[PDB]
Scaffold this active site. Structure first.
Site, PDB file in Angstrom:
ATOM      1  CD  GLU A 139     -28.653 -36.546  21.236  1.00 14.43           C
ATOM      2  OE1 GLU A 139     -29.836 -36.799  21.526  1.00 14.43           O
ATOM      3  OE2 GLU A 139     -27.829 -35.951  21.978  1.00 14.43           O
ATOM      4  CD  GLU A 140     -31.601 -40.399  18.158  1.00 19.77           C
ATOM      5  OE1 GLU A 140     -31.655 -39.607  17.176  1.00 19.77           O
ATOM      6  OE2 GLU A 140     -32.486 -40.454  19.039  1.00 19.77           O
TER       7      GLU A 140
ATOM      8  CG  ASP B 153     -26.450 -33.803  19.968  1.00 19.32           C
ATOM      9  OD1 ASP B 153     -27.471 -34.135  19.367  1.00 19.32           O
ATOM     10  OD2 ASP B 153     -26.116 -34.374  21.053  1.00 19.32           O
TER      11      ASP B 153
END
Ligand SMILES: Cn1c(=O)c2[nH]c(SCCN3CCOCC3)nc2n(C)c1=O
Length: 499
Positions: free
Chosen positions: A296-297, A278
């Protein structure tokens, strides 16, 4: 022409095949376990331990919304129950409910994205399903929290080497509470308590008019519909890892490891069973609960059990990472940022390990954000990124033969201004020091694939060690950056220096 270069991905180590038998899951000073291990059984909902709610309201544990210490004196948990046990037929009803126990934020919190999702994006039948079925079921699992999360959850604070293993069902109850914005002491802009922790309540998902928000909401309601309809049966482990014994990189005599590099595929689909990176923000999950929608989101949205790391994970220091084992994928997507779209529900086919965790291991490592491009070649900043990646990759107590390859890509590039070719070499060195092979996804950039492959084969064929390569990075800084964009690029400099 070829789509991938280097070692065949089929030759790379993956979980579960490569792992050793897990030890008996047991709580200890460094491992919080919130379920009955003696009753853990494949395909069975785990039983919470202890049987009756136990509360801790202090600076070392999550402050639970159902705590009798959550006051306003009135009981905030009683207020939450009364507010949420009302029929919703219109989005204003849900805004009004959430604000009944968040009066201080009634002028600060905007619900435009929630109103638009419900009234302007969803068709009539979908909205009807949302408020007749999905939302009431989310309320019910939220309000079940005291019977589900019976054991206090410690904060994974800075410098702690500590793990929490909880059930997917427990996570779903906690995330339903996050959706309804019930976590106390987690809201104020100018808070001191929890100022070093990410946002957890979902209120910023409801604000504004980005076309991004309905996509985020579709992705999350897909998860919530799934886990309220049929309880997931597995477990998830969250491990904060803080190292202090880092390599003396200039003296490291370790050889480089194997590389597979490709411009097609993704970490999450083509790195199954591998250590999946990530590209994290130091506040883990980044803007998942607000505006962000990059690597990441997106991962936190399609595997929402990751989001709960924000409840209890303090901002990462330079020598730290967070390792999450067992999160499940509930959605498929296309695109990113402005093009991100929720595609469909995903049925996760991952095997589970002997702790009933999906065989999916994700490490959050946050790269630095570089104001100026040449800043990243400063030796202290190169060493920082090496050490961060090393902490993310190292598994103390595990033989290299039992370590999966690292599945990664252009970590810290795009928004953070990293140079992909430098970051690729940094990850290759850190992986070598941790004795783990590398699977590198260049995300459509075929020239970068060729360049990383050529550099890796160049260095391996000449038997350069980690330290040999790091010294060349230091020479690049001194020759082309310190007294300087540079005149000569990194990989050209390296080839010339060695030849
Ligand atoms: C390897 N890799 C990625 O690089 C990646 N980026 C994104 S969205 C943000 C734009 N990126 C463009 C490439 O440079 C990093 C930033 N999703 C990704 N996924 C799923 C992936 O597997």
């Amino acid at each position: 022409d070829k789509k991938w270069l280097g070692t065949p991905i089929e030759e790379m180590r993956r979980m579960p095949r490569c792992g050793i038998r897990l030890p008996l899951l047991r709580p200890s000073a460094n491992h919080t376990v919130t379920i009955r291990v003696d009753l853990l059984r494949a395909g069975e909902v785990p039983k919470p331990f202890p049987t009756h709610y136990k509360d801790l309201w202090d600076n070392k544990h999550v402050k639970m919304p159902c705590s009798e210490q959550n006051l306003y004196a009135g009981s905030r948990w009683e207020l939450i129950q009364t507010a949420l046990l009302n029929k919703f037929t219109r989005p204003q009803n849900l805004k009004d409910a959430i604000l009944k126990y968040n009066v201080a934020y009634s002028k600060k919190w905007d619900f435009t994205a929630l109103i638009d999702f419900w009234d302007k994006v969803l068709e009539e039948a979908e909205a009807q399903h949302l408020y007749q079925s999905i939302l009431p079921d989310m309320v019910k699992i939220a309000l079940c929290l005291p019977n589900i999360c019976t054991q206090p959850i410690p904060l994974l604070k800075q410098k702690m080497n500590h793990s929490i293993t909880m059930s997917q069902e427990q996570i779903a109850s906690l995330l339903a509470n996050a959706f309804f914005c019930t976590f106390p002491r987690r809201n104020a802009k100018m808070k001191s308590e929890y100022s070093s922790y990410p946002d957890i309540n979902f209120n910023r998902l409801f604000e504004g008019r980005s076309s991004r928000k309905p996509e985020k909401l579709k992705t999350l309601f897909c998860y919530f519909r799934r886990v309220t309809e049929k309880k997931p049966t597995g477990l998830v482990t969250f491990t904060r890892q803080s190292l202090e014994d880092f390599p003396e990189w200039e003296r490291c005599e370790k050889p480089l490891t194997r590389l597979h590099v490709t411009y097609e595929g993704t970490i999450e689909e083509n790195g199954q069973g591998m250590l999946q990176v990530d590209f994290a923000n130091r506040f883990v999950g980044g803007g998942v609960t607000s505006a962000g929608l990059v690597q990441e989101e997106i991962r936190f949205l399609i595997n929402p059990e990751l989001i709960i790391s924000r409840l209890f994970t303090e901002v990462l220091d330079h020598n730290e990472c967070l390792i999450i084992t067992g999160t499940e994928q509930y959605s498929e997507y296309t695109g990113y940022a402005e093009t991100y779209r929720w595609s469909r529900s995903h049925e996760d086919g991952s095997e589970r390990d002997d702790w009933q965790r999906r065989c999916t291991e994700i490490v959050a490592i946050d790269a630095l954000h570089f104001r100026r491009y040449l800043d990243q070649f400063v030796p202290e900043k190169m060493r920082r990124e090496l050490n961060k990646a090393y902490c993310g990759f190292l598994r103390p107590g595990v033989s290299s033969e039992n370590l999966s390859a690292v599945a990664t890509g252009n970590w810290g590039c795009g928004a953070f201004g990293g140079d992909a070719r430098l970051k690729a070499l940094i990850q290759i060195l850190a992986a070598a020091a941790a004795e783990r092979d590398v699977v590198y996804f260049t995300f459509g950039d075929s020239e970068l694939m060729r360049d990383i492959y050529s550099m890796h084969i160049f260095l391996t064929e000449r038997k350069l060690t980690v330290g040999d390569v790091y010294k060349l990075l230091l020479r690049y800084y001194n020759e082309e950056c310190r007294n300087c964009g540079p005149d000569i690029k990194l990989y050209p400099f390296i080839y010339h220096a060695v030849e």
